[PDB]
Amino acid sequence: MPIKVGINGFGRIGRMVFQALCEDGLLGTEIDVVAVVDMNTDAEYFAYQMRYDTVHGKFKYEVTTTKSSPSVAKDDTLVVNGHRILCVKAQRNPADLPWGKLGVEYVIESTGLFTAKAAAEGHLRGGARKVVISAPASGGAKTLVMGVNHHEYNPSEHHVVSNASCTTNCLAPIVHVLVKEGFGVQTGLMTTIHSYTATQKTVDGVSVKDWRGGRAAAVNIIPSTTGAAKAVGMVIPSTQGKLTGMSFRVPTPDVSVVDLTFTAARDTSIQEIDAALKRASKTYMKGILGYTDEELVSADFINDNRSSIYDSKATLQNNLPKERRFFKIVSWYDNEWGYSHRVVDLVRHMASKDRSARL
Amino acid sequence: MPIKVGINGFGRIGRMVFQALCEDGLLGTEIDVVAVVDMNTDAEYFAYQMRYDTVHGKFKYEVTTTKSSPSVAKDDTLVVNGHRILCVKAQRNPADLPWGKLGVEYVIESTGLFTAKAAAEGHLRGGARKVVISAPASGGAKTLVMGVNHHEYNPSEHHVVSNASCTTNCLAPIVHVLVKEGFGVQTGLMTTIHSYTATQKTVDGVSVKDWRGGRAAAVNIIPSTTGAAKAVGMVIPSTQGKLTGMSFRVPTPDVSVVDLTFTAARDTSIQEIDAALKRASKTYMKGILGYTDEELVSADFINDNRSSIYDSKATLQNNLPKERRFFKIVSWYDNEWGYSHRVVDLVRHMASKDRSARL
Amino acid sequence: MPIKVGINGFGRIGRMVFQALCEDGLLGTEIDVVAVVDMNTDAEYFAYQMRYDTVHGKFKYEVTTTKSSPSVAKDDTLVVNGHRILCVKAQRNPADLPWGKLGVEYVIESTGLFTAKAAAEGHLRGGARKVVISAPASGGAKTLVMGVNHHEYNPSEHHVVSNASCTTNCLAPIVHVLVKEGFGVQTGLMTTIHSYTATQKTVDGVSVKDWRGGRAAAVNIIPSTTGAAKAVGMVIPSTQGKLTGMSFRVPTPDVSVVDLTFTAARDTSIQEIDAALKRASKTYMKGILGYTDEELVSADFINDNRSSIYDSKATLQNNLPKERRFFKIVSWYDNEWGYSHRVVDLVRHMASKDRSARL
Amino acid sequence: MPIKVGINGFGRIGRMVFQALCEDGLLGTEIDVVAVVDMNTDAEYFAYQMRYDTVHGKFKYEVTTTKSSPSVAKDDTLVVNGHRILCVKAQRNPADLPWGKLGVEYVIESTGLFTAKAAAEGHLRGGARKVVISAPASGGAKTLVMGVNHHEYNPSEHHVVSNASCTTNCLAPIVHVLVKEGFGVQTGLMTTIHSYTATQKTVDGVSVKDWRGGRAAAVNIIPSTTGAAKAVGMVIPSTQGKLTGMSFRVPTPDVSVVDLTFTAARDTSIQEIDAALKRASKTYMKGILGYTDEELVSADFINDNRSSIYDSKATLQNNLPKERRFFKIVSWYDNEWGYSHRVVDLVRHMASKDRSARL
Ligand SMILES: C=CC(C)(C)c1cc2cc3c(cc2oc1=O)O[C@H](C(C)(C)O)C3
C-alpha cells in the first residue's frame, strides 16, 4: 500500500489533480487515491465529468462506477483503470472527515474553503498526517513551489502546506532562474494575460467584491489586481517588496501568459538571460520550466505539464537593442494543467521526505 | 401620474425590466417604481450595474445613491432621472415585504425562486395587489403573452400572472399569425439557437440536472430540451400537443433565433405565409412582431424591442420550391431586451384593465 | 504497390487529409504522398503548420524538413517518420503540374480553385489519372459519398470526382438509412448549426457575394443558404427536389450539427427511427455513421472520424410523443476531420476499383 | 468653406473614418466627402455596411443610394443627410485616380497598399494636393499625432503625411505627458492587449509573414511584435531608442489596452504621475487623452473617441508601494473609433494650416 491520498473537493480543481496523477502513471502503483470528498454524491455524474473535458480532451482511462456494499442506495465508488475510489459527502468541518478510518495520510485540499491554515488543520484532527492546499493560503502554512523552494519542506514542522497559485508557479520559476543565475531582480512588474476561470460570469452579473470581475467574461478584457507576484516573495524571500503585478482576463478557455518587466541587479543582455533560461530548463529546472523557440500561440500549450514555458522568440524579438538592465520576459502556462501536475509533484516530494524522516 | 410598481429581484432581469421601463419614458410618470428587493443592499454596486451593460451599451439616465436612514449604514436609494427608488433586502418568505407600507400594488417578480403561484401569492399577502412573474410559472397562473392572448387577462380572476419565457414570446407571435391567418398548424418542431445565459458556466463546471448544460459555454454548441414550444400550446390552445422543440446554446453574448418547421393545415406557399407575416407586423401585431428583409446577423437585433423579428430573406431563400404544406420560418429575438419590454408592456396592460374593474 | 498521391493545395483541408492518412498508418504502405503543391514553398512553414493545430492539438508524429538536392536554397522537402514529400510550387494551370514527372496517379484537389470538372481535368494533362475534388464540384463531376453511393464509382467513366461537402457527408448517411430501411423521406428541411470556417471574417469585412457572410464571425449567429441538403438529391436520386436547408454560422472553432426535420413516407415513430440508426451504425454504415447516447457537447466530437454521429438522447427527447410522420433527427460531425478521412477512403476505394478494372 | 475630401479604400478603416466624420457633424458642413474609391462600386452594399455595425451599433444617420446618371444600372452614389458621395472604381495606380476632375484636395489613403510615401504621392499626380495615410508610413512621410506633435505640420513641406497607428495614438499621449511634465522616460517597454483585426484568420490559415498571426484568432492569445512603441520616437524625438513593445492579440472584437512599463528620469511617485495624467486630460490633452477612475472593462470604451483613456484605478492599484522610478501605466483605446476621429481631426488641422498659409 503506497502513498495514501485523499482528495477533498472534487470540482474542476480536484478533478484535474486526479487526472494529472493518472497521466503521470501514479494510479494504483505509486499513489493510492483512497477517497474523494464533495457535496455531490452522484458518482455517475463524476465519472462523466472525468471522461470529457472541453479543453483537455478525453480521459485516457476507463471510468466505471460501482457500489462499496450492496446496501448502498446508489453507486458511491468510482472505478478508474481498475482502482476503486470512494466518494464521500463533504463536511463543514474537515475534522469530521473519516481520514483516519480510511487510512489516508495526505489530503489534497481543493475545496477553496479551507485556505486558512487552522481551518485546514481540521484534516489532521480527522486522522490525516499532511495537507497540501491547492491554492495560496493564510495563517502561515509553508508556501512551497516545486523547483523553486520545495527543499525547504521540513517533515514535522510543515504539516499543512500551500502549493501557491497557478500564476505564481509560472512566474516563480522565471524569477528563480534570474536570481540563481546571478542576474538578480532589483524591481519587477508582472502582467498576466489570463484565460477565464469558473469564478467569472457568462453574462454581466453580480460580483460585489470585484466590480470588473462580475462583467461578461467572454466578450471583455477585464483588469484585475492579483497577488501572484507579491506571493513570489514568500518563496524567494529576497524579492519581497520588489515585485507586484496585475492580471487582464481575456476570453480564451484556458492557457495564460506572464509578461514580466524587470530591472536586473547587474549589467547583462537579453541574450545572456535567454541562454540561462534554456540552460536551466534542460537541467535543474527540467519538468518545471521549459522554453519554446517556435511561433506558438496559446492553444499550443494546452496539456503542457511544465509550470512555466519560456517564449524565447517572443522575448528576444521585443526587448531593447543592446539594453543592459531593463527587460521583458514572456512565459506561458496551461493555467489548469501545469498547476495540477505540481500539486501531485509536491505530494510525492513530501511523502518521499516524510518516509526519509523515518529511515 | 400614478401606478405603483415594485420589482422583486434586482439581478439581470429586474434591471433590464427596469431599464426597459425607463428607456421609453415611464419612470415616475405613468409608472412609479418604489422599491427593489434583492439579496444585496449595496446601492452603489447596483448603480454601477445599471450604468454599464456590455451588450446593451450605457444607460442614458443619470443614477445616484443617497441615504434614507441615519443609523443603518451606507446608501440604499437609487435616484434615476430625478426619481428615488429604495433597495430593501430579501427574506426567505415573500410575505415580509412592505408592499402596503410602500404602497405597491403591481409587483414584477423576477428572482426566479417564486415561480410556483402560491409563492407569488405571498406578495398579495404583503400588500401588493397584482403580480407578474417574469418567467414561466407553475402552480396554475395565467400565462399571458402580449400581442397573442394578453387581452384574456381578468382583473377579478387574474392577480398572479406569468409573462412566459423570452423563447415563447418569440415563437407564439409567428404561430399566432399562422393560426389566425387560417394557414393552420397541423404539426411543428422548433429549434432555438440561443445565446448563452447566466445559468451557464464559463469553464466546465457543476450542473447536476443538466449534464450537457454544465459544460463550458463559450466554446461549445450545447443542446438542450425546452418547454417553450409546449408552452405555446397553453397560450394558443389549438396547438396544444402539436408543437415541441429543443435548444442549441451557442457562444454569442445575446440575441437568439427561432427556427420553426411546421406542416400547415391546408395548401399555401411560403410567399403567402411571408406576406401574412409582414402584413400582421405592420398591423395587429405591430410593436410585437417586426420583420426584416435585410441581410442581418444577430448583433443587428441587439436592443430591438419587438418580441419576434421575422427574417424574410432567410425564410424565402431556404424553403422548398413550390411546396404547399412543409415550411421553415426563421425569427429573431433579443432574448434579453424584447422580453424586458414585454414585462412592462403587460404591467401597463393590466393597469389599463384592472383599474376599470375597481373604478 | 503504394498508390502515388499528390495533394494540390496544402491549406487546411489538404493538411487534414494528410493528417488523416498518417494517423491510419497508410502513409508509405497503401498511399505514398509524393508531393503537396501550394503557393508557398517554405517547407519549414509547412512543418510548423502540420505540427500545431489549435483545434486538433499537436501532431503526434515528428515532422522535419530537407532539401531534394543540395543546390536548393531553402528546404523543399517534408519528412514524416522517414516519408519524404516534395513541396512543389503551385501553377496557374494544373496541366503544368509535374504529376507524371513525379509518378503521381491520384490528385486530391483541395485549393477550391479547380472545382469545375473541366478545370480539374488539367491535372490529367499534367500526368495524373484521377482527381478527387474535396468540395462540391461542377461541370458534371460524379459526386460520391462513402457509405452511401460510393459503389457507383465507375473506373472507365469517372476520372474527376467530387467527395461532396462536409455537411452533405453528415446529412446523406441519415437520409440513406431512412430511405434504405423503408421509412422514406417525403419532404425534409435541414438546419446545420456550423462552426465558422476560413471563408468567414474576423471583423465585419468585405463579402459582396454573401452579405451576411462578411460580418464578424466570432460574435454573431450568421444565417446562410446552403446547397448541402439539395446535393443529397444527387447522391440519393429519390430525394431530388424533396430536401433543402440552410445554415447558421456560430462562433465555435470546429464541430457542427445537422438539425433535420422531415416527414416520413410511412407511419413510424421516433423510437423505430432511433433503433434503425443505431443498428445501421453498427453494421452497413459502420465507420461512416456513429451514434452516441451520452450527454455530449460539440467539443466531444473533435477528432471523431465518422461522417455523421447521431445524437440519440437529443433526438429521443425533443420529438413529439406518439407522432407517426413529422420528425427531428439530430446528428453531429467534426466538419474538418470526418470529411478528410472520407477523402482518404474515397481515394482507396477508387484505387481498388481501378486495379480490378484492368485485370 | 467646406474642404473637398476623397477616401481611397472603402474597406472597414475607410468606412470608420467616414462614420467618424459624420458623427462629428462634419458631413456637408466643414467637409465635402466627394467620393470613395474601392474595388466594389455597389452603393447598396456600402449602404448596408455603413447602416449596421456589429461592434459600434446602427449608424445614427440614414443612408440611401442613388445613380450619378439614369443609365447607372447598379446605384453608384451614397447619400447621407442629402450629401452625395460617388462610389468610384479603385485603380492600380493612385496617379490614375480622378481627384483633379472631382476637385478633391485631401485624400485619406486607407487601403494599406500605398503606405510608402512615394506610392501615396501618386494621388498628387491624380490631382490631389494632400494625402493623409491612415496607417504608419515608410519613406520619410511626416508622422503626426494629434495632441502630441500635430502643430509640426508644415503646409509648404508636408504633402503626404501619416496619422500613425491606433496603438501609437494610444501610447504617445501617455509618453507625451510624462516627458512634457518633467517626469521623463529613461527606458520603457509597452505591451498592448489588442482586439483581433481584419488581418487575422478565423481558423488556422496561411500567414507566411506572421506565423503566429495566421492562427485561429478568436480562440488564441497570439503574440506579435509591433512598431508602435518605437514609432513614438518619431513624434517625441527624445524617446528615440528608449521604447519598444509587443502585442498579444486576444479574442475580443474591439477595444484594446496599453500596459506601459517604464523608468522615470527622476524620482517621482505613482500618485504624482496619476495627478499629471488627469490634469493634462482636462487641459492641453483634452479630447485626446481621457481618464476613468471607475471599474471599467473593455466594452465600456466602445465608441469612446479619445485616443487614450488612462485607467486611474488599474494604474494606482497595481504599482509597487513607495516606488520612485519603476512604474506601470494602463490606458485603453477603442482601436477602431479613437483613431478614425483622429484621422478626421488631422485633415481638419491640415486644412486650417493650409488655409492660413495662403493668406
Ligand atoms: C433570455 C431570457 C429569459 C426569459 C430570461 C430566458 C430565461 C432562460 C432561463 C433558462 C433557460 C433558458 C432561458 O431562455 C430565455 O429566454 O434554460 C435554463 C434551464 C434551467 C437549464 O433549463 C434556465
Largest sheet of chain A: 9 strands, mixed
- Given the helix and strand composition of chain A, which structural class is it? alpha/beta
CATH superfamily of the largest domain in chain A: NAD(P)-binding Rossmann-like Domain
Q: Biggest interface, which chains?
A: B-C, 52 and 50 residues
Question: What's the total helix number of chain A?
Answer: 9
Helix content of chain A: 25-40%
Q: Which strand-content bin applies to the residues of chain A? A: 25-35%
PDB class: oxidoreductase
Keywords: Apo-Protein, glycosome, Trypanosoma cruzi, oxidoreductase
Assembly: tetrameric
Entry title: Structure of Glycosomal Glyceraldehyde-3-Phosphate Dehydrogenase from Trypanosoma cruzi Complexed with Chalepin, a Coumarin Derivative Inhibitor
Could you please describe the fold and organization of this structure?
- It is classed as oxidoreductase.
- The entry lists the keywords Apo-Protein, gGAPDH-Chalepin complex, glycosome, Trypanosoma cruzi, oxidoreductase.
- The structure is a homotetramer of 359-residue chains.
- With 359 residues, chain A is an alpha/beta fold.
- Chain A has 2 domains: 2-164 and 336-355, Rossmann fold (3-Layer(aba) Sandwich), CATH 3.40.50.720; 165-335, 2-Layer Sandwich (Dihydrodipicolinate Reductase, domain 2), CATH 3.30.360.10.
- Helix content of chain A is 27%, strand content 26%.
- The first copy, chain A, has 9 helices and 18 strands.
- The first copy, chain A, has helices at residues 12-23, 43-51, 99-102, 117-125, 166-180, 228-235, 270-282, 312-317, 337-358, and strands at residues 3-8, 31-38, 52-53, 57-58, 63-66, 77-80, 83-89, 106-109, 130-133, 142-143, 160-162, 185-195, 222-225, 243-250, 256-264, 289-292, 308-311, 326-333.
- In chain A, strands 5-6-7-2-1-8-9-11-10 form a 9-stranded mixed beta sheet.
- In chain A, helix 1 crosses helix 9 and helix 5 packs across helix 6.
- The radius of gyration of chain A is 21 Å and the shape is globular.
- The first copy, chain A, starts with a strand and ends with a helix.
- Chains in contact: A-B, A-C, A-D, B-C, B-D, C-D.
- Chains B and C meet through strand 12, strand 13, strand 14, strand 15 and strand 18 of B and strand 12, strand 13, strand 14, strand 15 and strand 18 of C.
- The structure holds ligand BRZ.
- The ligand C=CC(C)(C)c1cc2cc3c(cc2oc1=O)O[C@H](C(C)(C)O)C3 binds at residues 13, 165-167, 197, 199, 210, 213, 335-336, 339 of chain B.
